[PDB]
Design an enzyme around this catalytic site. Structure first.
Site, PDB file in Angstrom:
ATOM      1  N   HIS A 142       0.834  -1.205   0.000  1.00  0.00           N
ATOM      2  CA  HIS A 142       0.000   0.000   0.000  1.00  0.00           C
ATOM      3  C   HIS A 142       0.872   1.258   0.000  1.00  0.00           C
ATOM      4  O   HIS A 142       0.652   2.189  -0.787  1.00  0.00           O
ATOM      5  CB  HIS A 142      -0.937  -0.052   1.221  1.00  0.00           C
ATOM      6  CG  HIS A 142      -1.813   1.164   1.407  1.00  0.00           C
ATOM      7  ND1 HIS A 142      -3.183   1.128   1.260  1.00  0.00           N
ATOM      8  CD2 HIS A 142      -1.509   2.447   1.729  1.00  0.00           C
ATOM      9  CE1 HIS A 142      -3.677   2.337   1.479  1.00  0.00           C
ATOM     10  NE2 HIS A 142      -2.688   3.156   1.778  1.00  0.00           N
ATOM     11  N   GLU A 143       1.867   1.312   0.887  1.00  0.00           N
ATOM     12  CA  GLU A 143       2.715   2.500   0.964  1.00  0.00           C
ATOM     13  C   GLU A 143       3.515   2.694  -0.317  1.00  0.00           C
ATOM     14  O   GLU A 143       3.622   3.816  -0.829  1.00  0.00           O
ATOM     15  CB  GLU A 143       3.655   2.434   2.174  1.00  0.00           C
ATOM     16  CG  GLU A 143       2.989   2.176   3.528  1.00  0.00           C
ATOM     17  CD  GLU A 143       1.739   3.003   3.785  1.00  0.00           C
ATOM     18  OE1 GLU A 143       1.661   4.148   3.268  1.00  0.00           O
ATOM     19  OE2 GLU A 143       0.838   2.507   4.506  1.00  0.00           O
ATOM     20  N   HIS A 146       1.602   4.234  -3.096  1.00  0.00           N
ATOM     21  CA  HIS A 146       1.483   5.695  -3.092  1.00  0.00           C
ATOM     22  C   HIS A 146       2.600   6.347  -3.915  1.00  0.00           C
ATOM     23  O   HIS A 146       2.366   7.349  -4.599  1.00  0.00           O
ATOM     24  CB  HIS A 146       1.473   6.259  -1.666  1.00  0.00           C
ATOM     25  CG  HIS A 146       0.150   6.147  -0.965  1.00  0.00           C
ATOM     26  ND1 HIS A 146      -1.034   6.578  -1.521  1.00  0.00           N
ATOM     27  CD2 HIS A 146      -0.172   5.670   0.264  1.00  0.00           C
ATOM     28  CE1 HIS A 146      -2.024   6.360  -0.668  1.00  0.00           C
ATOM     29  NE2 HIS A 146      -1.528   5.822   0.431  1.00  0.00           N
ATOM     30  N   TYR A 157      -4.639  14.179  -2.998  1.00  0.00           N
ATOM     31  CA  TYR A 157      -5.041  13.420  -1.803  1.00  0.00           C
ATOM     32  C   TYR A 157      -6.190  14.082  -1.037  1.00  0.00           C
ATOM     33  O   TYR A 157      -6.088  14.370   0.154  1.00  0.00           O
ATOM     34  CB  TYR A 157      -3.846  13.206  -0.889  1.00  0.00           C
ATOM     35  CG  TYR A 157      -3.915  11.997   0.014  1.00  0.00           C
ATOM     36  CD1 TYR A 157      -4.092  10.726  -0.499  1.00  0.00           C
ATOM     37  CD2 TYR A 157      -3.744  12.119   1.375  1.00  0.00           C
ATOM     38  CE1 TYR A 157      -4.111   9.613   0.319  1.00  0.00           C
ATOM     39  CE2 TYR A 157      -3.759  11.006   2.206  1.00  0.00           C
ATOM     40  CZ  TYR A 157      -3.934   9.760   1.676  1.00  0.00           C
ATOM     41  OH  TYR A 157      -3.903   8.677   2.530  1.00  0.00           O
ATOM     42  N   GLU A 166      -6.252   6.243  -2.487  1.00  0.00           N
ATOM     43  CA  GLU A 166      -6.288   5.230  -1.435  1.00  0.00           C
ATOM     44  C   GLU A 166      -6.663   3.854  -1.975  1.00  0.00           C
ATOM     45  O   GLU A 166      -6.026   2.847  -1.636  1.00  0.00           O
ATOM     46  CB  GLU A 166      -7.275   5.653  -0.340  1.00  0.00           C
ATOM     47  CG  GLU A 166      -6.621   6.481   0.747  1.00  0.00           C
ATOM     48  CD  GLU A 166      -5.475   5.728   1.375  1.00  0.00           C
ATOM     49  OE1 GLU A 166      -5.714   4.598   1.855  1.00  0.00           O
ATOM     50  OE2 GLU A 166      -4.322   6.237   1.329  1.00  0.00           O
ATOM     51  N   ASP A 226     -10.609  13.430   7.456  1.00  0.00           N
ATOM     52  CA  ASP A 226      -9.859  12.458   6.666  1.00  0.00           C
ATOM     53  C   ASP A 226      -9.677  12.944   5.231  1.00  0.00           C
ATOM     54  O   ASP A 226      -9.829  12.188   4.272  1.00  0.00           O
ATOM     55  CB  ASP A 226     -10.563  11.101   6.736  1.00  0.00           C
ATOM     56  CG  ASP A 226      -9.823   9.988   6.021  1.00  0.00           C
ATOM     57  OD1 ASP A 226      -8.581   9.941   6.064  1.00  0.00           O
ATOM     58  OD2 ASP A 226     -10.503   9.130   5.443  1.00  0.00           O
ATOM     59  N   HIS A 231      -9.901   7.614   3.173  1.00  0.00           N
ATOM     60  CA  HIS A 231      -9.854   6.237   3.656  1.00  0.00           C
ATOM     61  C   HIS A 231     -11.234   5.631   3.871  1.00  0.00           C
ATOM     62  O   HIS A 231     -11.334   4.457   4.262  1.00  0.00           O
ATOM     63  CB  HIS A 231      -9.087   6.142   4.983  1.00  0.00           C
ATOM     64  CG  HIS A 231      -7.650   6.529   4.883  1.00  0.00           C
ATOM     65  ND1 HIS A 231      -7.210   7.812   5.113  1.00  0.00           N
ATOM     66  CD2 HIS A 231      -6.556   5.799   4.569  1.00  0.00           C
ATOM     67  CE1 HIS A 231      -5.898   7.856   4.948  1.00  0.00           C
ATOM     68  NE2 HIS A 231      -5.477   6.647   4.618  1.00  0.00           N
TER      69      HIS A 231
HETATM   70  C1  LIG Z   1      -2.497   0.455   5.261  1.00  0.00           C
HETATM   71  C2  LIG Z   1      -2.575   1.152   6.612  1.00  0.00           C
HETATM   72  C3  LIG Z   1      -2.105   0.225   7.723  1.00  0.00           C
HETATM   73  C4  LIG Z   1      -1.798   2.458   6.593  1.00  0.00           C
HETATM   74  C5  LIG Z   1      -2.430   3.559   5.742  1.00  0.00           C
HETATM   75  N1  LIG Z   1      -1.594   4.766   5.781  1.00  0.00           N
HETATM   76  P1  LIG Z   1      -1.556   5.712   4.405  1.00  0.00           P
HETATM   77  O1  LIG Z   1      -0.663   5.232   3.347  1.00  0.00           O
HETATM   78  O2  LIG Z   1      -2.975   5.816   3.866  1.00  0.00           O
HETATM   79  C6  LIG Z   1      -0.986   7.408   4.944  1.00  0.00           C
HETATM   80  C7  LIG Z   1      -1.825   7.981   6.096  1.00  0.00           C
HETATM   81  C8  LIG Z   1      -1.146   9.194   6.683  1.00  0.00           C
HETATM   82  C9  LIG Z   1      -1.387  10.469   6.183  1.00  0.00           C
HETATM   83  C10 LIG Z   1      -0.761  11.578   6.737  1.00  0.00           C
HETATM   84  C11 LIG Z   1       0.114  11.422   7.788  1.00  0.00           C
HETATM   85  C12 LIG Z   1       0.364  10.165   8.289  1.00  0.00           C
HETATM   86  C13 LIG Z   1      -0.262   9.056   7.741  1.00  0.00           C
HETATM   87  N2  LIG Z   1      -1.078   8.248   3.760  1.00  0.00           N
HETATM   88  C14 LIG Z   1      -0.001   8.455   2.993  1.00  0.00           C
HETATM   89  O3  LIG Z   1       1.115   8.046   3.228  1.00  0.00           O
HETATM   90  O4  LIG Z   1      -0.326   9.171   1.910  1.00  0.00           O
HETATM   91  C15 LIG Z   1       0.765   9.303   0.967  1.00  0.00           C
HETATM   92  C16 LIG Z   1       0.406  10.274  -0.105  1.00  0.00           C
HETATM   93  C17 LIG Z   1       1.315  11.237  -0.513  1.00  0.00           C
HETATM   94  C18 LIG Z   1       0.982  12.146  -1.498  1.00  0.00           C
HETATM   95  C19 LIG Z   1      -0.264  12.107  -2.082  1.00  0.00           C
HETATM   96  C20 LIG Z   1      -1.169  11.145  -1.698  1.00  0.00           C
HETATM   97  C21 LIG Z   1      -0.836  10.232  -0.716  1.00  0.00           C
HETATM   98  C22 LIG Z   1      -3.838   3.852   6.265  1.00  0.00           C
HETATM   99  O5  LIG Z   1      -4.821   3.324   5.744  1.00  0.00           O
HETATM  100  N3  LIG Z   1      -3.905   4.642   7.340  1.00  0.00           N
HETATM  101  C23 LIG Z   1      -5.133   4.884   8.078  1.00  0.00           C
HETATM  102  C24 LIG Z   1      -5.052   4.255   9.464  1.00  0.00           C
HETATM  103  C25 LIG Z   1      -5.419   6.387   8.211  1.00  0.00           C
HETATM  104  O6  LIG Z   1      -4.445   7.173   8.184  1.00  0.00           O
HETATM  105  O7  LIG Z   1      -6.606   6.729   8.327  1.00  0.00           O
HETATM  106 ZN   LIG Z   2      -2.741   5.172   1.932  1.00  0.00          ZN
END
Ligand SMILES: CC(C)C[C@H](NP(=O)(O)[C@H](Cc1ccccc1)NC(=O)OCc1ccccc1)C(=O)N[C@@H](C)C(=O)O
Ligand SMILES: [Zn+2]
Ligand SMILES: [Ca+2]
Ligand SMILES: [Ca+2]
Ligand SMILES: [Ca+2]
Ligand SMILES: [Ca+2]
Ligand SMILES: [Cs+]
Length: 316
Positions: A142-143, A146, A157, A166, A226, A231
């Protein structure tokens, strides 16, 4: 670092033993030279400075508890690289073998993981909501996805484009999990979420509503939390993708499944050839229809099934 390629052994977050590609120069470093321009894993040491230190180990054995998140971040980045190269002929996230960097032990009790524009970052969790998040192959993929999105469609985003962003990460996270073929499913994060509760997950693609996420456009979230529900509303697209692959009848609309491999081809082509930073859900449907047309023909079952799946989730 400059050194010679070596093979270490260790245990991951779930206690499973695996071999890891390392580099020797005085220490053994978590630096895999076998993939592109390298996969590099760093220790953030419970702080928030990034990347931290390139992970160094005296003996090339990674069996300490502190080592486990690093083992899995490193190994699962390799699996994810292999999926994109072998399945989609894509060389790393930028298509030109960019070095892949990850940091583990980010902050204290941190219940999340992210891509910061340059690298992947994993918390250890607080031991209640999450254990160290790199223990989930779907999470790692998933990461990294991105990063793929950053270099391709560039989906902003927030709101619908952000929910597509997402869902793309959940879709390819799941397809990587199936590629590795260890306990694969259409759930997100089950291997690292809530150690005290069996059988749950952070999100479900097969039934998003089990965790209150929408499974139909008429149930989309329209508020500001969010980033406009990125998400949350991802469940609408995740459900459509699940239906394309596996089939089903959803709100009375029947979808003929075409399988995971074709789902992956259709969505990879949509992501890389048709989606743009501002694409909304309706534009994703059009991109997926066109992608399936390119791959399989306008009269194909694959095109028909894409249309059925978006119909089923209320996206025209
Ligand atoms: C797969 C799971 C375990 C991890 C996943 N993280 P995630 O990958 O969704 C993380 C969330 C985040 C945002 C900001 C600061 C910190 C964290 N977002 C994130 O890393 O977005 C990266 C991005 C960069 C540029 C443009 C678009 C996207 C998620 O669903 N997070 C949930 C818990 C949430 O944040 O609601
Ligand atoms: Zn994500
Ligand atoms: Ca050691
Ligand atoms: Ca699984
Ligand atoms: Ca999963
Ligand atoms: Ca659990
Ligand atoms: Cs949940």
């Amino acid at each position: 670092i400059t050194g010679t390629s070596t093979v270490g052994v260790g245990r991951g977050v779930l206690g499973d033993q695996k071999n890891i590609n390392t580099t020797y120069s005085t220490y053994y470093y978590l630096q895999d030279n076998t993939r592109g321009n390298g996969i590099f894993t760093y220790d953030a040491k419970y702080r928030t400075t990034l990347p931290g230190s390139l992970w160094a180990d005296a003996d090339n054995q990674f069996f300490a508890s502190y080592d486990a998140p690093a083992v899995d971040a490193h190994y699962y980045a390799g699996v994810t690289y292999d999926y994109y190269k072998n399945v989609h002929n894509r060389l790393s996230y930028d298509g030109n073998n960019a070095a892949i960097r990850s940091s583990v032990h980010y902050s204290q009790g941190y219940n999340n993981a992210f891509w910061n524009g340059s690298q992947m970052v994993y918390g250890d969790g607080d031991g209640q909501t999450f254990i160290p998040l790199s223990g989930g192959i779907d999470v790692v993929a998933h990461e990294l996805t991105h990063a793929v999105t950053d270099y391709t469609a560039g989906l902003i985003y927030q709101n619908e484009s952000g929910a597509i962003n997402e869902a793309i990460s959940d879709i390819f996270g799941t397809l990587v999990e199936f590629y590795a073929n260890k306990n694969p499913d259409w759930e997100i994060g089950e291997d690292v979420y809530t150690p005290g509760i069996s059988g749950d997950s952070l999100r479900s693609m097969s039934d998003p509503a089990k965790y209150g996420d929408p499974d139909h456009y008429s149930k989309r979230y329209t508020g500001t939390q969010d980033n406009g529900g990125v998400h949350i509303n991802s469940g609408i697209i995740n459900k459509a993708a699940y239906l394309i692959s596996q089939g089903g009848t959803h709100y009375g609309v029947s979808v003929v499944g075409i399988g995971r491999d074709k789902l992956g081809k259709i969505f990879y082509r949509a992501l890389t050839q048709y989606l743009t930073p501002t694409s909304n859900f309706s534009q994703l449907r059009a991109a997926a229809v066109q992608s399936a047309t390119d791959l399989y023909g306008s009269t194909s079952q694959e095109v028909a099934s894409v249309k059925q799946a978006f119909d089923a989730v209320g996206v025209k």
